[PDB]
Subunit: 279 residues, 2 copies
């Protein structure tokens, strides 16, 4: 069987630690994640792939300086994907996720580094205070995914984890829930692609503040800290990094994934995003 | 699926290169290789496991050499499947140390690793070994001829029950301090010829043929082995008695040496009756 939905088989050799996966397009994280008519691997999937791969290769994880370079599109031909892990003497693990292109060449999709550090003691959020601060407008799930549909982003049942987005000033607070379609798979992932992708989806609220429609995908992430486990229902607090405003050539924001009580389970700092489509 | 009949899956981690295999006992190299009532992995299998493992770990050829191999413990597969592993440790001088072990299910205790085989490997060039004149060797080994029925009848009497897949001996020609054994892949397993480099049926048949030189028990050891070429459907095993060491040349129909083994040693036990 498979080691992990993103790690089908270990293919390590004397030179490199490596895992390999054949994505067909029938997996929920591809068939229900269609951007501009083509099934594309969610940005969140790469982080979970690197996390699981590191967990296997080692027998308090922090990612740093992650980049998303090229989308992994799965058309009529299955795609052979790989992740290689390079350990360094200082405890740092460099990962690279690529796929095999047919003419031999490797297509690079994501790079980054990881370190196993101690877990920081982040104080829990008062969700009541945040909800009041984000009372300018409330966006329903229908409103969010209607906007996405207009931008050419077709999210299937497994990737409609947004229940609603509470909009504030330079921040939004999004309520997330694992879709009932994929609850069976909750235990197969640490960072579930449905929840984590929904957290990144919720950055739409920052754009909806501007109202004027535009598609703004992330290309980089400065830091990610896994503090604890994810639950089926969570919250995403998204804030513009000081000095960053909506409409910038490169929009920078942070995302905190919190449990029902306001505990920070995953802290993401320094998303960088570029506008790729208007209206 | 499985990478190789002896390498089911790669399980390497940052610490070690590793492959793992769960043997059920239904495989031909276990059900047809019964010693003293137990299905046991043939000694020949360990070399093929190490060879296949090295081929995967290096990204795959010929010219491989094993040196200072030991066989310490038999891998018996009873009613419960057995979990086997091979770990490969590369060294700076180009040498690869391998260890083949299995997880023991000692109830009331915590699982422990049982070592079955150890050795080293090096990727070296192919030696230009002169072909043997099989006609001359057949003449030198004219003292006596043992048929297949005679050999495996003797084995059965000794408590060694070889099934169809491990009856590769067609006959043994007896000489002085040497024998020449005619080997053939049993038709039961000819389909699998391409799945192995060192096919366990042929290589085990070569080691079986050491019976011709007039009991041998574990631990075993091998000073050197050189893989020169591929194994064929029909082959010859030239066994020469060199302390308690003998050499085996696995040859094709024309006398070309495809596998050269030097310095097999096995513990000597008194023979009962
Ligand atoms: Mg590489
Ligand atoms: Mg080990």
């Amino acid at each position: 069987g498979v080691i992990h939905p993103f790690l089908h088989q270990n293919t390590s050799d004397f030179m490199e630690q490596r895992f390999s996966s054949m994505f067909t397009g029938q997996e929920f994280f591809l068939s229900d994640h269609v951007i501009k008519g083509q099934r594309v691997l969610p940005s969140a999937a790469y982080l979970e792939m690197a996390r699981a791969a590191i967990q296997q290769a080692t027998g308090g994880l922090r990612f740093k300086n992650v980049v998303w370079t090229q989308p992994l599109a799965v058309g009529p031909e299955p795609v052979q994907a790989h992740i290689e892990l390079y350990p360094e003497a200082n405890g740092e693990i460099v990962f690279e996720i690529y796929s095999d292109s047919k003419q031999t060449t490797e297509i690079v999709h994501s790079q980054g580094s990881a370190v196993l550090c101690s877990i920081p003691d982040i104080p829990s959020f008062d969700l009541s205070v945040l909800q009041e601060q984000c009372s300018l407008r409330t966006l329903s799930a229908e409103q969010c995914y209607d906007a996405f549909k207009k931008m050419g982003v077709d999210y299937g049942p497994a990737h409609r984890g947004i229940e609603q987005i509470l909009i504030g000033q330079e921040q939004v607070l999004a309520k997330l829930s694992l879709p009932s379609s994929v609850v069976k798979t909750q235990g197969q992932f640490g960072l579930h692609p449905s929840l984590l992708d929904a957290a990144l989806q919720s950055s739409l609220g920052l754009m909806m503040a501007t109202s004027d429609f535009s598609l703004i995908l992330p290309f980089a992430l400065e830091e990610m800290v896994i503090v604890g486990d994810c639950s089926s229902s969570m919250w995403a607090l998204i804030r513009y990094r000081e000095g960053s405003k909506a409409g910038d050539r490169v929009e920078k924001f942070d995302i905190d994934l919190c449990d029902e009580n306001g505990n920070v389970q995953v802290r993401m700092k320094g998303f960088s995003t570029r506008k790729i489509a208007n209206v």
